[PDB]
Amino acid sequence: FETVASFDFRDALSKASTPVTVVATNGPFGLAGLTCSAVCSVCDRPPTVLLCINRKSYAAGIIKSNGVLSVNWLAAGQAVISQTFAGVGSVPMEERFADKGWQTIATGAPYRMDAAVSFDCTIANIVDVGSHSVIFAEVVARNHAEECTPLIYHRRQYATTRSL
Amino acid sequence: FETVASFDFRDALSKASTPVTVVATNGPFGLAGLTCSAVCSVCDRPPTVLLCINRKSYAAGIIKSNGVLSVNWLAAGQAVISQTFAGVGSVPMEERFADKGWQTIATGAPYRMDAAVSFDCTIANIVDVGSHSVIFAEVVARNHAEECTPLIYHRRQYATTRSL
Ligand SMILES: Cc1cc2nc3c(=O)[nH]c(=O)nc-3n(C[C@H](O)[C@@H](O)[C@@H](O)COP(=O)(O)OP(=O)(O)OC[C@H]3O[C@@H](n4cnc5c(N)ncnc54)[C@H](O)[C@@H]3O)c2cc1C
Ligand SMILES: Cc1cc2nc3c(=O)[nH]c(=O)nc-3n(C[C@H](O)[C@H](O)[C@H](O)COP(=O)(O)OP(=O)(O)OC[C@@H]3O[C@H](n4cnc5c(N)ncnc54)[C@H](O)[C@@H]3O)c2cc1C
Ligand SMILES: NC(=O)c1ccc[n+]([C@@H]2O[C@H](COP(=O)([O-])OP(=O)(O)OC[C@H]3O[C@@H](n4cnc5c(N)ncnc54)[C@H](O)[C@@H]3O)[C@@H](O)[C@@H]2O)c1
Ligand SMILES: NC(=O)c1ccc[n+]([C@H]2O[C@H](COP(=O)([O-])OP(=O)(O)OC[C@H]3O[C@@H](n4cnc5c(N)ncnc54)[C@H](O)[C@@H]3O)[C@@H](O)C2O)c1
């Protein structure tokens, strides 16, 4: 079989819906983070998530060298955080974390305490596939947030959820 | 660092949102499918997605031996399909594909033609983590899909999107 055109793969996926997260890290290689929707739960023992991130991202090599990361699922009111971490405004990495709502829990990675969900993690496995590194991380702590109406991304813009 | 309790991990994840897909297959080993939310896009060259499925399931066994599969991102009106393929109502595996919206495209896997996105795929690699196989699949065809607001899962209920 021949694979579909890269153009067709991306266009088709624009019609899917995803949550929006920020993946962040800190440690001796410095502070970095980026907006990521290619994230999912893998297994619950040991508890493990994965995230796929373009090796061309400035955050990629810093995350992999720090060895720890957080995954922060954003709430519907947090689209400006998603924009910041996607490179809009070109905010310097460190500056992205200036707001007091970013703290640490266990690893030293920045955790967004009012995200719908925030997992603090250590990297367990990295598999490089095409342009991206698929990073498997084990979850060592989490936040305890009240508001969790989701920020969603769909056909190239933000959305949230509705009943039905 | 100690990893969080399994119960605590599933708990937090209920507060995150996901898309809802059906993963299906057919071939020399038979017809099978199940509902899968742990799916994501990996890279666009070669166009590759991944999905995480428990190795204990009837469907996992057949998918892996057929070597081909489709991933079908469901639309907002299709919660009944998601329920069927999660085992709600105990519909026998092979009776699950009655509906005519299921057609063949390239590999012989059944593709849901009215799904928001339907990818027909060949398995490229499998990474085992805990109880799950993370299956990497290369996309060799797609449904050229009519417009569709997607099915989302959040807080143990189905939902769809709206605007901010
Ligand atoms: C909804 C959504 C979902 C997304 N999902 C994903 C995904 O799952 N995976 C993925 O890989 N991408 C994803 N992206 C893309 C991603 O967020 C970013 O890589 C992309 O947005 C590009 O980032 P950037 O413009 O910050 O460029 P980058 O070049 O990666 O980073 C720029 C930043 O690095 C910093 N920096 C760069 N160079 C230097 C230097 N020489 N010295 C000091 N600091 C420097 C700076 O402080 C600057 O602001 C997603 C984007 C959106 C909007
Ligand atoms: C919205 C939604 C999203 C879903 N997403 C996924 C997904 O991304 N991936 C996926 O694999 N399933 C997913 N499921 C589950 C899937 O659809 C089926 O429901 C699967 O065949 C479960 O059927 P069953 O519960 O009757 O298990 P069974 O009929 O009993 O099959 C065997 C059982 O699974 C077992 N088992 C279940 N969970 C674990 C575990 N975490 N570790 C070890 N053993 C386990 C046991 O080993 C036991 O024998 C999802 C379901 C819904 C409703
Ligand atoms: N990615 C998955 O394997 C997944 C996702 C949702 C539900 N299921 C399944 O749920 C069952 C029972 O009900 P429930 O309480 O989990 O619905 P639930 O929505 O209440 O459980 C919460 C969350 O756990 C996450 N997850 C990651 N690995 C998981 C795992 N091994 N088991 C359960 N969740 C996992 C999911 O994203 C899910 O939404 C199953 O027998 C089953 O196979 C599995
Ligand atoms: N997985 C990723 O790397 C990923 C995911 C989303 C967006 N992006 C990127 O998205 C931008 C805008 O995204 P968009 O949805 O608005 O429009 P888009 O038409 O460029 O992409 C549409 C969808 O295709 C998928 N996708 C796009 N590029 C991919 C890649 N290189 N590898 C794997 N999947 C990919 C994603 O699911 C994305 O949402 C960028 O400038 C950018 O680098 C990358």
From Swiss-Prot, chains A, B:
- UniProtKB keywords: Aromatic hydrocarbons catabolism, FAD, Flavoprotein, Monooxygenase, NAD, Nucleotide-binding, Oxidoreductase
- Kindly list the positions annotated as binding NAD(+): S41, V42, C43, D44, H132, Y153, H154, R155, R156
Indicate the transmembrane segments per the record. none
Alphabetized Gene3D superfamilies for the sequence = Electron Transport, Fmn-binding Protein, Chain A
SUPFAM superfamilies under this entry?
A: FMN-binding split barrel
Role of this protein:
Reductase component of a two-component system that degrades 2,4,5-trichlorophenol. TftC provides the FADH(2) required by TftD. TftD oxidizes 2,4,5-trichlorophenol (2,4,5-TCP) to 2,5-dichloro-p-benzoquinone, which is chemically reduced to 2,5-dichloro-p-hydroquinone (2,5-DiCHQ). Then, TftD oxidizes the latter to 5-chloro-2-hydroxy-p-benzoquinone.
**Name this protein carries in UniProt:** NADH:FAD oxidoreductase
Gene encoding this chain?
Answer: tftC
